[PDB]
């Protein structure tokens, strides 16, 4: 309301175990999973898509 040294209430959001390795590791697991599926999705996409340039079925026949 007036004093700027009285931090507003963040208790509804604060985690108690915020400084722990487990805490960070969980968020990096989510980031990592997302990076993993993006890598696997990119690989699948690139491989299937670029295969159009390999000899078509009529040519292989």
């Amino acid at each position: 309301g007036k004093s700027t040294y009285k931090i507003p209430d963040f208790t509804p959001y604060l985690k108690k175990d915020r400084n722990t390795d487990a805490n960070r590791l969980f968020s990096y697991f989510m980031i990592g999973s997302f990076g993993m599926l993006s890598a696997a999705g990119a690989k699948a996409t690139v491989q299937d898509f670029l295969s159009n340039m390999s000899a078509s079925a009529d040519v292989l026949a």
Binding site: M53, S54, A55, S56, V59
Partner: protein
């Protein structure tokens, strides 16, 4: 350094663009040029043959290759325009250099109207040369064999690239190894990227450097001779001459320019004391 380095890529894109466009005619030189140039990729170790079949879309140059070259030939000029714009934006930080090699920050002119009107002179000179070829001698720079339809059976007497690729072809022939020759040929273009390092001069450019000017003259004439040797038959004595010219080409970057530029530095300093 940055506009120059992007420039080297522009030059590679222009080569690829022109090579693919030449295939599109599907005359004898189109087919056989595509065959021999695309087979250089077979030299890539382990995967080379697989890559060639992938590029061709089959087991030899044929319809799949021609249709993909059309699509890429249409695309590549747009990529080239983007890189041409990039090298100008990179240049804009320093501005154009000038023939004296000094700063021009002391004395600038607006691009328009001065260089607009000076560009018109060379535009009209260019259009005169264009007119003489296009209207009076339209086939002077071409190969008659490209007016024969592609025939995979008959091999033309001599399979050569278009004239502007001939120096790189001479460099490739000079190395006996297939992979060696491909590397040398690519290195001949990529070595332009080291000029910023091997030029040790404290002065920009050759206007005031008599020895550098002589060396540059020999370098340029050697590059023209390599061009000529690219279209001779593989016969004596052109085989050895091609090897000597190739050594000269590379030694300009690796030995002569570093040495001459070092010595000229010392001559400027001692000579003006």
């Amino acid at each position: 350094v940055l506009p120059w380095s992007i420039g080297v890529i522009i030059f590679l894109l222009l080569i690829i663009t022109a090579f693919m466009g030449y295939v599109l005619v599907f005359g004898q030189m189109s087919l056989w040029g595509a065959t021999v140039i695309c087979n250089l990729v077979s030299a890539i170790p382990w995967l080379g043959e697989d890559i060639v079949h992938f590029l061709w879309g089959g087991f030899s140059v044929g319809n799949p290759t021609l249709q993909r070259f059309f699509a890429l030939h249409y695309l590549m000029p747009f990529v080239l325009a983007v890189f041409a714009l990039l090298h100008l934006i990179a240049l804009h930080t320093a501005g154009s250099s000038n023939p004296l090699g000094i700063t021009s920050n002391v004395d600038k002119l607006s691009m328009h109207p001065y260089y607009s009107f000076k560009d018109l002179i060379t535009v009209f000179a260019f259009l005169l040369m264009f007119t003489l070829f296009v209207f009076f001698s339209p086939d002077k720079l071409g190969h008659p064999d490209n007016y024969i339809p592609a025939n995979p059976m008959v091999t033309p007497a001599s399979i050569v690239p278009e004239w502007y690729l001939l120096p790189f072809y001479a460099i490739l022939r000079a190395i006996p190894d297939k992979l060696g020759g491909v590397i040398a040929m690519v290195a001949a273009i990529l070595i332009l990227l080291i000029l910023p390092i091997v030029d040790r001069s404290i002065i920009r450019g050759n206007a005031f450097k008599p020895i550098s000017k002589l060396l540059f003259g020999f370098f340029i004439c050697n590059f023209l001779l390599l061009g000529v040797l690219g279209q001779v038959h593989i016969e004596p004595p052109f085989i050895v001459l091609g090897q000597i010219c190739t050594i000269f080409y590379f030694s300009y970057f690796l030995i002569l320019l570093p040495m001459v530029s070092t010595i000229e530095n010392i001559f400027f300093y001692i000579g003006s004391l």
